[PDB]
Tab-separated table of C-alpha atoms and ligand atoms in Angstrom:
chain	number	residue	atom	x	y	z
A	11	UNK	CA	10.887	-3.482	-3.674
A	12	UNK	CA	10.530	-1.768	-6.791
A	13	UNK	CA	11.447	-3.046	-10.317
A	14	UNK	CA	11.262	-1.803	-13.850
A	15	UNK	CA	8.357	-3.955	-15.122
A	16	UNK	CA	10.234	-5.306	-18.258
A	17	UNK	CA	12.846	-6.690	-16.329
A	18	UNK	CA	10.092	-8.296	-13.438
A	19	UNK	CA	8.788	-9.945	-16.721
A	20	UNK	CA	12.186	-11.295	-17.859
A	21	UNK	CA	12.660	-13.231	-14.703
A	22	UNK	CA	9.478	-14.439	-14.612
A	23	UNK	CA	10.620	-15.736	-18.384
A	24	UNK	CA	13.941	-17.143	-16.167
A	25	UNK	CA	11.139	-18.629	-14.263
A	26	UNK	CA	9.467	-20.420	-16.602
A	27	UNK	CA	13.065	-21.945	-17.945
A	28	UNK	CA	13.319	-19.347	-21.113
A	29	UNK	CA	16.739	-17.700	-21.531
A	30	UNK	CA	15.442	-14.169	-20.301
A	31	UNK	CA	17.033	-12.325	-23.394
A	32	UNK	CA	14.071	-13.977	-25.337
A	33	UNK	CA	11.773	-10.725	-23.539
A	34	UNK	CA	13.742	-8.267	-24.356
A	35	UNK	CA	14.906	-9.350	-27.948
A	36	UNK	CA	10.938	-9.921	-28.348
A	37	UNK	CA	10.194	-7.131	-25.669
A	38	UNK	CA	7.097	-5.375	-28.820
A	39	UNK	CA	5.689	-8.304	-29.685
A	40	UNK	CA	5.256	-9.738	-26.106
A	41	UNK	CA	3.528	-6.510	-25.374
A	42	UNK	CA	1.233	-6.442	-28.152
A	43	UNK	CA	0.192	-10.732	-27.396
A	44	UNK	CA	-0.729	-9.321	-24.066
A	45	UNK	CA	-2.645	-6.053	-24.995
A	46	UNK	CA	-4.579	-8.669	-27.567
A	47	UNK	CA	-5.239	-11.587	-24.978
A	48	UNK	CA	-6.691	-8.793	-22.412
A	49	UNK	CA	-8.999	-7.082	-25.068
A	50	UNK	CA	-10.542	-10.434	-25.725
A	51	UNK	CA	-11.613	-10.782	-22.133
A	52	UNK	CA	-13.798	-7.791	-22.383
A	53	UNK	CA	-15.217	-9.221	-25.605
A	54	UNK	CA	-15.996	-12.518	-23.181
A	55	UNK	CA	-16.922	-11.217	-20.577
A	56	UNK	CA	-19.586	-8.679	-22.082
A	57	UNK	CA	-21.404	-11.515	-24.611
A	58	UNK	CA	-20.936	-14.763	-22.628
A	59	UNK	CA	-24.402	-15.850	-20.415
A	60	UNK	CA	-22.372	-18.941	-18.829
B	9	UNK	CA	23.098	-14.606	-11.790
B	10	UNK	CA	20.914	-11.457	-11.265
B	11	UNK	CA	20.644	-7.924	-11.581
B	12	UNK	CA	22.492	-5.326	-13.451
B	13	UNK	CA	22.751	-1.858	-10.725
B	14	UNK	CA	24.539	1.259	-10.658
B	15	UNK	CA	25.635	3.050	-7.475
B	16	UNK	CA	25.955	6.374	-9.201
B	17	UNK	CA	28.752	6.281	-11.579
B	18	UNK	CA	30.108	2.716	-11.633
B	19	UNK	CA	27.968	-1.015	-12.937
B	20	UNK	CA	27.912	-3.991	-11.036
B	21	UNK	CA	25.718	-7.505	-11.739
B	22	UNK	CA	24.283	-8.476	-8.369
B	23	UNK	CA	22.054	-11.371	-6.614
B	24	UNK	CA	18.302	-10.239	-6.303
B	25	UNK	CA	17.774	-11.055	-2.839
B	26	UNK	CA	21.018	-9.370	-0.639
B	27	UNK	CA	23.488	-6.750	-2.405
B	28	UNK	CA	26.014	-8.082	-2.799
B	29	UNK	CA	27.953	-5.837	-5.829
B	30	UNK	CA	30.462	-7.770	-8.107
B	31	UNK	CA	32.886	-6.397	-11.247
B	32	UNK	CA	31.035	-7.664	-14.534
B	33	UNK	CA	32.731	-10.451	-16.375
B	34	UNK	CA	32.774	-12.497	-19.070
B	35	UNK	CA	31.683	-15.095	-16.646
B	36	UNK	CA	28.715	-14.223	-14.706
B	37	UNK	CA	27.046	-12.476	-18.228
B	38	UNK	CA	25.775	-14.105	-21.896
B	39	UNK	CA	26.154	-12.181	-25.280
B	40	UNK	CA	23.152	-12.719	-27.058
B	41	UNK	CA	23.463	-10.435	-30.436
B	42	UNK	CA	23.461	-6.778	-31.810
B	43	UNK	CA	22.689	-3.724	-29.079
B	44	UNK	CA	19.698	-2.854	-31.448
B	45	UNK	CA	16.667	-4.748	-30.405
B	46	UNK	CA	16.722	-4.369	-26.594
B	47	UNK	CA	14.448	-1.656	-25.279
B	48	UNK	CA	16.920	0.495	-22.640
B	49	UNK	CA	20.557	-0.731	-22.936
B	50	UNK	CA	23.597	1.094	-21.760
B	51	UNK	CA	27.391	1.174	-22.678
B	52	UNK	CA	29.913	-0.001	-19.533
B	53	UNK	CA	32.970	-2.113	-20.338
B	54	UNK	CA	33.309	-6.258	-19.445
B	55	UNK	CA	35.981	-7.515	-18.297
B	56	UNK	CA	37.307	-10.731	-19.770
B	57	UNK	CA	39.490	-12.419	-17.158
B	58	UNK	CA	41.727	-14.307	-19.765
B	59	UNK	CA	42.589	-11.904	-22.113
B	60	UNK	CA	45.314	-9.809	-19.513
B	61	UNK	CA	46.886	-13.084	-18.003
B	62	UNK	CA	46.997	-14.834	-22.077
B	63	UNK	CA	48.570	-11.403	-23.211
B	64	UNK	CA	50.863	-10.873	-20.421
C	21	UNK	CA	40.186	-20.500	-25.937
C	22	UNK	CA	42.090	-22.265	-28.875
C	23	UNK	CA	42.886	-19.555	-31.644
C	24	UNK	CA	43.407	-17.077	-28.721
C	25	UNK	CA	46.305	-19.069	-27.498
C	26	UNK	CA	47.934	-17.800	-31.379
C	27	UNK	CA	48.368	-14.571	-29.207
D	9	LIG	C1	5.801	-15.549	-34.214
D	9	LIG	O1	4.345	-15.503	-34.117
D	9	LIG	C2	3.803	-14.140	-34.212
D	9	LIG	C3	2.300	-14.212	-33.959
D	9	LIG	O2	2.104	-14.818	-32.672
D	9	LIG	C4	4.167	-13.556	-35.574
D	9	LIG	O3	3.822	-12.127	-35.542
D	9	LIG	C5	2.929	-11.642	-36.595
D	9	LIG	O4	3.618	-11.724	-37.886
D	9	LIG	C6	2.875	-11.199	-39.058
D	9	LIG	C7	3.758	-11.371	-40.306
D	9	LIG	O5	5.052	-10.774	-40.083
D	9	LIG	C8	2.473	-9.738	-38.784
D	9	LIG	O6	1.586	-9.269	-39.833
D	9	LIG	C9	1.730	-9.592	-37.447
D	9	LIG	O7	1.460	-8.181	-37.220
D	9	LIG	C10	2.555	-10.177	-36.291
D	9	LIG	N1	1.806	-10.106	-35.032
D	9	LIG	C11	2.182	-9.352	-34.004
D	9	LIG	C12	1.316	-9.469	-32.737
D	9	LIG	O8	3.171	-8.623	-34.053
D	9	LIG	C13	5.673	-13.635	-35.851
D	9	LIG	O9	5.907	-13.230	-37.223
D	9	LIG	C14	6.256	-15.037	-35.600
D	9	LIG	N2	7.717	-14.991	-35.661
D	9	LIG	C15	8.453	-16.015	-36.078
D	9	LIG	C16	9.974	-15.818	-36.040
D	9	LIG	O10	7.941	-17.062	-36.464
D	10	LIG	C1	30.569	3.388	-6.651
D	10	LIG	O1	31.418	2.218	-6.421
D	10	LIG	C2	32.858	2.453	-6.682
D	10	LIG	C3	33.637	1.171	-6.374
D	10	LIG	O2	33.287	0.707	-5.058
D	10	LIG	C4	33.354	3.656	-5.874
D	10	LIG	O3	34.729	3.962	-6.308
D	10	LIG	C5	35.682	4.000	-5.200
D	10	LIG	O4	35.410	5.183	-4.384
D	10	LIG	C6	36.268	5.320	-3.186
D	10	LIG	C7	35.795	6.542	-2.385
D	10	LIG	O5	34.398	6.388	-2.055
D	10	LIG	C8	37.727	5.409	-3.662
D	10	LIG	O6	38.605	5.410	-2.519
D	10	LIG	C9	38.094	4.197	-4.534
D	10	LIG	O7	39.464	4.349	-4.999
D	10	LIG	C10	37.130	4.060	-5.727
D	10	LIG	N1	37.448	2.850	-6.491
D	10	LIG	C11	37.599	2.834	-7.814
D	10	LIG	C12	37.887	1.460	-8.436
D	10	LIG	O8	37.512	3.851	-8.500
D	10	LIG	C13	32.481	4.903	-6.078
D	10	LIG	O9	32.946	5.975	-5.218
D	10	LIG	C14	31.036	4.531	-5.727
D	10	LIG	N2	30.131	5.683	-5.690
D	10	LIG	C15	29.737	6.394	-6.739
D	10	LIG	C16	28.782	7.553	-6.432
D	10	LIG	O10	30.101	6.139	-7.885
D	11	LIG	C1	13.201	4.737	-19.301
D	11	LIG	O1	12.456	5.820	-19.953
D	11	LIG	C2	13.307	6.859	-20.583
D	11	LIG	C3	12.391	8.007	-21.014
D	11	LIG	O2	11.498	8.299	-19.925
D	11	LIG	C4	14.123	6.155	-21.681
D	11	LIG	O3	15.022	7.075	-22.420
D	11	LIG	C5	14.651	7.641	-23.742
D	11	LIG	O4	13.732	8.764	-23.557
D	11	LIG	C6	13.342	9.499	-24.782
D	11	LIG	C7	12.434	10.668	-24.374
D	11	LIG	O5	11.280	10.180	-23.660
D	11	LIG	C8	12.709	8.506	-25.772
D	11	LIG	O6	12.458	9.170	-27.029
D	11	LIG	C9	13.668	7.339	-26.056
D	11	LIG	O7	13.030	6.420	-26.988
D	11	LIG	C10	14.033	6.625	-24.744
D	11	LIG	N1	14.955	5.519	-25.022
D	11	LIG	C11	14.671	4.241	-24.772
D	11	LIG	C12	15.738	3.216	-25.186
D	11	LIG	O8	13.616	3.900	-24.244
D	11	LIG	C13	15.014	5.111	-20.988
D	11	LIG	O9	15.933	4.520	-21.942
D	11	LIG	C14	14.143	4.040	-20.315
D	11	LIG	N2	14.976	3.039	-19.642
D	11	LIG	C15	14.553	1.797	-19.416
D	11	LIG	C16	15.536	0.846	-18.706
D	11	LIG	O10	13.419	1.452	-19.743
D	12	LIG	C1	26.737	3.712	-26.872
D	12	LIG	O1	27.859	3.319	-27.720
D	12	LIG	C2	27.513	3.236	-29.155
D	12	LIG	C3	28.709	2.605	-29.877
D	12	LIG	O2	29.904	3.366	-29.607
D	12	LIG	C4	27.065	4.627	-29.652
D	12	LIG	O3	26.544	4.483	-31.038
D	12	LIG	C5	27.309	5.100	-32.142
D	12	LIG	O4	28.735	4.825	-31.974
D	12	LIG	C6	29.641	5.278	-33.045
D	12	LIG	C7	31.075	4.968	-32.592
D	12	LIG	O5	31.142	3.629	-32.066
D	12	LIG	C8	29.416	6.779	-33.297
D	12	LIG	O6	30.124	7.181	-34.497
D	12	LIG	C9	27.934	7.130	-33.483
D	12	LIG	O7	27.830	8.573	-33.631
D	12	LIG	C10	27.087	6.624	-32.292
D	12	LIG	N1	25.672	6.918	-32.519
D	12	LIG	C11	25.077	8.015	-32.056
D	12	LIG	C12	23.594	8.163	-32.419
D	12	LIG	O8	25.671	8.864	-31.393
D	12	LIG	C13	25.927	5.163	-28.766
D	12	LIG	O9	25.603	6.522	-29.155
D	12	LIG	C14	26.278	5.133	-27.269
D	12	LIG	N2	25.114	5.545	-26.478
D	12	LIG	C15	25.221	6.302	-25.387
D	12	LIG	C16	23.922	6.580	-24.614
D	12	LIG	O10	26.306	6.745	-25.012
């Protein structure tokens, strides 16, 4: 069933217990800690032996 | 409780799992501040169920 | 509900 992906994040927010307006008053900066956290697993992943 | 949908031309919040349509209220929606921040909003009137019965 | 009831 499709769902605009903003609003599947703020119920997985309601999931977690967090009043979902806290996404999409915050909807920028949530982004941007993702976009960051997935850029360092390349950086991880491409120097890491272990 | 859910979801808010539109069949066209009117708004309704519903449950996630089974439509099930209802008139939006006071009651089954939260404010939570200015219509600034959030990313795709839309204007629709809510109905506050004690206003038309206190000023009656 | 209180100041509403001024109504
Ligand atoms: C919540 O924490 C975030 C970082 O996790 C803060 O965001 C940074 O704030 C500084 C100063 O305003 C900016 O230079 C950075 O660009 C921000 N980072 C991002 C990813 O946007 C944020 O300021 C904190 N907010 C509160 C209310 O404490
Ligand atoms: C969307 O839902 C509303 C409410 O169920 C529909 O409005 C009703 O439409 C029927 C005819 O289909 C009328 O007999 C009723 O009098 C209408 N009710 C009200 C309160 O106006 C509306 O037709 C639905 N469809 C669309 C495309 O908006
Ligand atoms: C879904 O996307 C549309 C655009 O595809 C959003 O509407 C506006 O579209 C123009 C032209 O692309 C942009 O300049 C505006 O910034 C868009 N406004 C907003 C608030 O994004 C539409 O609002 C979006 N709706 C949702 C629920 O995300
Ligand atoms: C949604 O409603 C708001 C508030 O009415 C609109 O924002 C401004 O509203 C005032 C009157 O309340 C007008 O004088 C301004 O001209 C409106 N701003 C703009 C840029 O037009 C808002 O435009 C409405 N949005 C939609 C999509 O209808």
């Amino acid at each position: 069933l499709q769902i605009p992906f903003a609003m599947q994040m703020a119920y997985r927010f309601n999931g977690i217990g967090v009043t979902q307006n806290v996404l999409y008053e915050n909807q920028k900066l949530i982004a941007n800690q993702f976009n960051s956290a997935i850029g360092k697993i390349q950086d991880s992943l491409s120097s890491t032996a272990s | 409780e859910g979801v808010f949908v539109s069949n066209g031309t009117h708004w309704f919040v519903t449950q996630r799992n089974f439509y099930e349509p209802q008139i939006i209220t006071t009651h089954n929606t939260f404010v939570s501040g200015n219509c600034d921040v959030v990313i795709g909003i839309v204007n629709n009137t809510v109905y506050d169920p004690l206003q038309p019965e206190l000023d009656s």
